[PDB]
């Protein structure tokens, strides 16, 4: 019980496909491109996360002022509550002061 009786289907991986064979290309676009472009501009994803790093409270604060006017009402309400909970935890709870 809790463990499968048969072996799973093999996990076949193509190590020489397009995405793996051309990974890392143009990462030094700045050094070798006379600094016309910056590597962070090659990052794709949420517009509030491109070329930026932070903790959950920092990520949530950044999302609310960058795309908060476009968020769904229910999702925005949960975001504000998440920021309230994290504000109390980080600034009032913990082992160190």
Partner RNA sequence: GCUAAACCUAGCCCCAAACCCACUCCACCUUACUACCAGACAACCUUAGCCAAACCAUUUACCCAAAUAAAGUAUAGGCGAUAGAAAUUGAAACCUGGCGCAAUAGAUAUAGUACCGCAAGGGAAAGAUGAAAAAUUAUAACCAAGCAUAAUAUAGCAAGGACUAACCCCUAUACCUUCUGCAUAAUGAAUUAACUAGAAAUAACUUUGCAAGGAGAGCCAAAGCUAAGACCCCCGAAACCAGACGA
Partner RNA sequence: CCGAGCCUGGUGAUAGCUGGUUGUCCAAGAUAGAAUCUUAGUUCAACUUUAAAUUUGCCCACAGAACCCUCUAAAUCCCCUU
Partner RNA sequence: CUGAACUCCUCACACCCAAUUGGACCAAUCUAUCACCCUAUAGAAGAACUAAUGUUAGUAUAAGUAACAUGAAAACAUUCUC
Partner RNA sequence: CUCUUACUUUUAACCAGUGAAAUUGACCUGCCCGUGAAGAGGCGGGCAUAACACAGCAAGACGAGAAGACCCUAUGGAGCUUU
Contact positions toward K ion, by CB under 5 A?
94
Choose the one of K ion, RNA, other proteins, none that binds residue 72, judging by a C-beta under 5 to 8 angstroms depending on kind: none
Cβ nearer to other proteins, comparing 4 with 70: 4
Q: Is 81 in the site for other proteins (CB under 8 A)?
A: yes
- What is the binding site for RNA (CB under 7 A)? 1-6, 8-9, 11, 13, 15, 19-20, 23, 28, 30-31, 35, 37-39, 41-42, 44-48, 50, 52, 55-56, 62-69, 75-77, 80-90, 92-97
CA 32 centroid distance within chain: 27
Q: Least CB distance from residue 61 to K ion, whole Å?
A: 17
Rounded distance between C-alpha atoms, residue 68 and residue 64, angstroms: 4
Contact between 50 and 43 (Cβ < 8 Å): yes
CA 55 centroid distance within chain: 11
Place of tokens 């990462």: 27
Binding other proteins (rule: CB under 8 A), the pick from 12, 13, 19, 45 is 45
Contact between 47 and 70 (Cβ < 8 Å): no
């Amino acid at each position: 019980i809790g463990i499968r009786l048969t072996l799973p289907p093999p996990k076949v991986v193509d190590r020489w496909n397009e995405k793996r064979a051309m990974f890392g290309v143009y990462d030094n676009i700045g050094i070798l491109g006379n600094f016309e472009k910056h590597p962070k501009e090659l990052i794709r994803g949420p517009i509030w996360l491109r070329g930026w790093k932070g903790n959950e409270l920092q990520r949530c604060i950044r999302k609310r002022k960058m795309v908060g006017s476009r968020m769904f009402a229910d999702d925005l309400h949960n975001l504000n509550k998440r920021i309230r909970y994290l504000y109390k935890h980080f600034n009032r709870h913990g082992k160190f002061r």
